[PDB]
Design a binder for these strands. Structure first.
Ligand SMILES: O=C(O)CCC(=O)C(=O)O
Ligand SMILES: [Mn+2]
Length: 202
DNA sequence: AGGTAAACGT
DNA sequence: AACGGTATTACCT
């Protein structure tokens, strides 16, 4: 019944914290605005993104990279809000990863139709640390597979406040998001946000 | 050697 | 529309 070895879903874990989380997303984006990044191959992603914390995930021509500087503003990413950090630590603890210290939070925003094709999170040098993923606003279908792209997928609806954590044996599993269905949510109005916490540095 | 980008047709 | 090809290569370090 558990998501996978080392992996768990904490349904509605972030429900009570969500209004403050969303105020702080708005604050982060007021400094480093959401933008749709362009892949190395030249395609614009459907998800709009920004980052907070000491390191931010970015693409550039040469690949994927963590950087301490937002290439759009040329200034450091905004500091990680304490609300984000406190929620992360509680969720990580509840999921069995009490020692997790993220230094990076990638904020994804899904408009209707936006998706994330199956991928692995492998840009982090220390793969001992888990990923903590917090869903806010409109629901989305999350794909969670195995070590190989063709391993069979579990498909789970992720609703507002749901937190998923993966690590250990499932750290490098393929995962993704199916094209967002249009809808209404009273706190985000017409979108989904996802916060993805990582330990990106050493 | 090995790391690793990947987001159209059936 | 769920599944899988593509990187079965071309380039870095
Ligand atoms: O949006 C999600 O639920 C997953 C996001 C994700 O996998 C990523 O940003 O790497
Ligand atoms: Mn991911």
């Amino acid at each position: 019944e558990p998501l996978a070895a080392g992996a768990v879903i904490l349904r509605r874990f972030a429900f009570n914290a969500a209004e403050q989380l969303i105020r702080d997303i708005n604050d982060v984006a007021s400094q480093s605005p959401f933008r749709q990044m362009v892949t190395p191959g030249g395609y614009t992603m459907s998800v709009a993104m920004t980052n907070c914390g000491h390191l931010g995930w970015t693409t550039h021509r040469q690949g994927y990279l963590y950087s301490p500087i937002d290439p759009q503003t040329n200034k450091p990413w905004p500091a990680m809000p304490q609300s984000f950090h406190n929620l992360c630590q509680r969720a990580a603890t509840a999921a069995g990863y009490p020692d997790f210290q993220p230094d990076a939070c990638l904020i994804n925003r899904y408009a209707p139709g936006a998706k994330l094709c199956l991928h692995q999170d492998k840009d982090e040098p220390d793969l001992r640390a888990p990923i903590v993923s917090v869903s806010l606003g409109l629901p989305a279908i999350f794909q969670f597979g195995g070590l190989k792209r063709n391993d069979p997928l579990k498909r789970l609806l992720l609703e507002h406040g749901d937190v998923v954590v993966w690590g250990g044996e499932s750290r490098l599993f393929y995962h993704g998001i199916q094209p967002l269905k249009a809808g209404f949510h009273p706190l985000t109005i017409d979108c989904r946000y996802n916060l993805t916490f990582r330990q990106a540095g050493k």
